[PDB]
Design a protein around this ligand. Structure first.
Ligand SMILES: CCCCCCCCCCCC
Length: 111
């Protein structure tokens, strides 16, 4: 009914993504090779993007089929884009801090 049609496929995709995320969380043991700034960061970014896309699709489909007391419902798309941007910025800042720590541990000018 409410979750039928595109909602069913979207829910299945989101459940599969959550299962993959949990599997990756289990896989992630300790840092060293396990923590990949260039690979784990991209994997997490893709996971967040897919999750936000699925949530936005579900919410939009529900609202359009039920109406909304607000103009431009796509504002939630803007919120999802902002969340993705902030997540990517946080990941980039963490990577930069890790690189700075690695350089300092090996010797580099402070300024
Ligand atoms: C665009 C591809 C970037 C690849 C970066 C590899 C980083 C390896 C670091 C190894 C440190 C010992």
């Amino acid at each position: 009914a409410e979750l039928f049609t595109n909602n069913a496929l979207n829910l299945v995709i989101i459940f599969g993504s959550c299962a993959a995320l949990i599997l990756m969380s289990f896989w992630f043991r300790r840092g060293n090779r396990k923590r990949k700034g260039f690979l784990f960061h991209a994997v997490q970014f893709l996971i967040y993007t897919i999750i936000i896309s699925a949530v936005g699709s579900i919410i939009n489909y529900v609202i359009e089929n039920y109406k909304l007391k607000f103009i431009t419902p796509g504002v939630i798309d803007f919120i999802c884009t902002s969340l993705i941007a902030v997540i990517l910025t946080i990941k980039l800042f963490l990577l930069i801090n890790q690189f700075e720590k690695q350089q300092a541990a090996k010797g580099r000018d402070i300024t």
